[PDB]
């Protein structure tokens, strides 16, 4: 729900930002239309075309105000003031970004070290694309297919899954994709018994 | 001490319009009591001169339409400086004045008449008075940029990264 | 085509398969490159859909970070859509990519709007979209059709605006 | 008029890019991150170009005097005229400006040659020193 709230907030914020920006184009499209009608026709919105025949903006001349110490030094030190504020906000945003990056990054080094020191060597290993997920996951070929077995029903392929809850490693076979639970070990544990 | 800019400054005089009403005849009379009317302008000097004497495209159209405007030239040509003159009028609600200053350069070698130079823009809309577009554009753009910054920082907060997938939401 | 001698095969009025007269269509390097890239990616998508029928990643191709990455994506596209039997297409695509004045679709649309707002000939418009000229006289000499047809101030304004529109690499 | 014409075309393409990013954000499903970055960077650099070009032609924009058309009727379109001819910031920008003045301690109508001027001179030198220091640091290690 907070994601929906923030998405609506950013939508309305960008709409507010663009509403004032539209008026700039509305006021400035008039000059070319006055100078050249045909080029200017398309610039304005249909409502503004209906409002008036566009010849609105015409060139005019006004002199530049006489300069003095009074406003430039105040303006440039006021701009120094605004850019010192931008530097402050720059440092603060960079600090927040680096704190977030450091925390997350050390988290994935924690998981990374768990993966590195949890994996042994063991058998023939590759990457496969999951039928359901479509991503790349590690898989191990354990089957006797290369050992001379003619059993075509099963390929002896087990996908490696890092257990989120226990931070351990588990093997999921290809064939038994129906049992989805923690009781897989006992549900699949079969045996051969000889009775005399 | 905080001052509201005179460009956005808007004066309302309900008593004057109630007593006299809005007309081109007294539009300058309506403007007289406003803060925008400088007391150092030659128009006020002409006003006291008249008072003492009594006690003792559309520019050419409005030129030829009114005789008091004539009297305005024949009383204003003698005095050079900051003066208030009408720009255009469309009845019964719209009037705009022309804010210009005159320097009657009568020096030898200049065949042109007195120099007329603009100073300000004033628009009389109804009973209200209005007085840079560059500032408007920059203000709109900067507020848009502020809103964009807020939206983008929120979106970056929403962003979450994982090494094995990339960035997702 | 110094004297706009386009011949019968390339007349301004074209007769389509529907029998209606149409304006002759001319595209510069950017427009032609974008059109051919769009056609190739659409054909690749159709091929993938057909293969899925018989039996995400495409967003990264159109949006290229750099020229070299764009060229690598172009090579992959040609390998997966053309078969490598057409060297002339590869040479034309490389020439388009190396000397494409404009990479973004919106900027190309801006250039098209600026050039064809005046209503010039499609040949002249495409030439101006292909050639970047510093001065109006340079374009007028290098484009003899533009002589006597466009004012020098307008040509200078168009050229300066186009030079400003060029996206920095 | 040429400067305002260039201002117009560039502002129009900027508004077109804003409309673009708007109608690709308005979708109920968010596209890939990379497309959003590309759109952001393009539109934002375009805003930079807008600012730079607005900065270049300040004199042409200042010389132009605004006047309503004789044919334009104000009696019926006074609301539209007053929509365009008023130009104050949003209040959250002016209160942000006042909070920035208060937080920085900056105020620019009474400043004179005493302590603030010796602080102003003592600030120039840190920038130059840091620039020279980082030039030296870059030169210390071969980066090619």
């Amino acid at each position: 729900e907070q994601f929906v709230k923030r998405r609506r907030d950013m939508l309305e914020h960008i709409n507010l930002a663009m509403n004032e920006s539209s008026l700039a184009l509305e006021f400035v499209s008039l000059l070319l239309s006055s100078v050249k009608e045909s080029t200017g026709m398309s610039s304005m919105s249909p409502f503004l075309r209906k409002v008036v025949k566009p010849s609105s903006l015409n060139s005019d001349k006004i002199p530049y105000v006489a300069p003095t110490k009074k406003e430039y030094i105040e303006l440039d030190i006021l701009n120094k003031g605004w850019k010192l504020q931008s530097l402050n906000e720059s440092k603060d945003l960079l600090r927040a970004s680096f704190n977030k990056l450091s925390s997350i990054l050390q988290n994935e080094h924690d998981y990374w070290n768990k993966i590195m020191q949890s994996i042994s060597n063991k058998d023939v290993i590759f990457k496969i694309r999951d039928r359901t997920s479509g991503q790349k996951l590690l898989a191990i070929k354990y089957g006797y297919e290369d050992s001379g077995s003619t059993y075509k029903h099963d390929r002896g392929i087990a996908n490696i899954r890092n257990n989120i809850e226990s931070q351990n490693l588990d093997l999921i076979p290809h064939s038994s994709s129906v049992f989805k639970g923690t009781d897989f070990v006992h549900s699949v544990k079969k045996f051969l018994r000889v009775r005399i | 001490m905080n001052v509201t800019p005179l460009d956005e400054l808007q004066w309302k005089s309900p008593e004057w319009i109630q007593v006299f009403g809005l007309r081109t005849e007294n539009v300058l009379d309506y403007f007289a009591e406003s803060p925008f009317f400088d007391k150092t302008s030659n128009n006020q000097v002409i006003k006291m001169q008249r008072q003492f004497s009594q006690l003792n495209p559309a520019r050419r159209q409005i030129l030829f339409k009114y005789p008091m405007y004539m009297q305005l030239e024949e009383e204003l040509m003698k005095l050079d400086g900051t003066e208030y003159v009408l720009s255009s009028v469309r009845e019964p609600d719209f009037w705009v004045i022309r804010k210009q200053r005159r320097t009657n350069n009568s020096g030898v070698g200049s065949a042109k008449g007195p120099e007329i130079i603009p100073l300000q823009d004033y628009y009389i809309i109804g009973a209200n008075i209005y007085q840079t577009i560059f500032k408007i554009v920059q203000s709109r753009l900067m507020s848009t940029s502020y809103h964009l910054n807020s939206t983008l920082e929120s979106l970056y907060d929403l962003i979450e990264f994982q090494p094995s997938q990339g960035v997702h939401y | 085509a110094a004297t706009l001698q386009l011949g019968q095969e390339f007349q301004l009025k074209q007769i389509n398969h529907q029998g209606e007269e149409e304006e002759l269509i001319a595209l510069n390097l950017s427009e032609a490159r974008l059109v051919i890239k769009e056609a190739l990616v659409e054909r690749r998508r159709a091929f993938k859909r057909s293969q899925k029928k018989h039996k995400a990643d495409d967003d990264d191709f159109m949006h290229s970070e750099t020229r070299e990455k764009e060229l690598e994506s172009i090579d992959v596209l040609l390998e997966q859509t053309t078969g490598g039997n057409n060297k002339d297409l590869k040479n034309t695509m490389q020439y388009l990519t190396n000397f494409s004045r404009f990479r973004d679709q919106e900027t190309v649309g801006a250039v098209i709007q600026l050039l064809k707002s005046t209503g010039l000939h499609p040949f002249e418009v495409a030439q101006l979209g292909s050639l970047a000229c510093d001065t109006a006289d340079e374009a007028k000499t290098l484009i003899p059709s533009l002589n006597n047809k466009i004012s020098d101030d307008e040509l200078e304004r168009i050229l300066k605006e186009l030079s400003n529109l060029e996206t920095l690499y | 008029g040429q400067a305002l014409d260039a201002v117009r075309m560039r502002l129009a393409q900027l508004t077109h890019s804003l409309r673009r990013i708007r109608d690709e954000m308005s979708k109920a499903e968010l596209p890939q991150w990379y497309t959003l970055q590309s759109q952001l960077n393009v539109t934002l650099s375009q805003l930079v170009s807008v600012t730079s070009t607005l900065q270049h032609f300040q004199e042409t924009l200042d010389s132009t005097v605004v006047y309503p058309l004789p044919k334009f009727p104000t009696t019926s379109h006074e609301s539209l005229v007053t929509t365009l001819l008023r130009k104050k910031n949003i209040p959250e920008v002016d209160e942000w400006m006042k909070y920035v003045r208060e937080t920085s301690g900056v105020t620019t109508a009474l400043l004179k040659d005493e302590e603030i001027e010796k602080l102003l001179q003592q600030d120039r030198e840190i920038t130059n020193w840091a620039r020279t220091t980082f030039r030296n640091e870059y030169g210390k290690h071969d980066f090619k």
């Binding site: 919105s45 | - | 098209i112 707002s117 | 077109h16």
Partner: peptide, 25 residues
């Protein structure tokens, strides 16, 4: 020509922030 015109983005609902103060005589 012109690929597409701009959609009308008028905001009459905007309340405006015109400061009104010199009303008293």
């Amino acid at each position: 020509p012109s690929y597409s015109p701009t959609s009308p983005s008028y905001s009459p609902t905007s309340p405006s922030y015109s400061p009104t103060s010199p009303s008293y005589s």
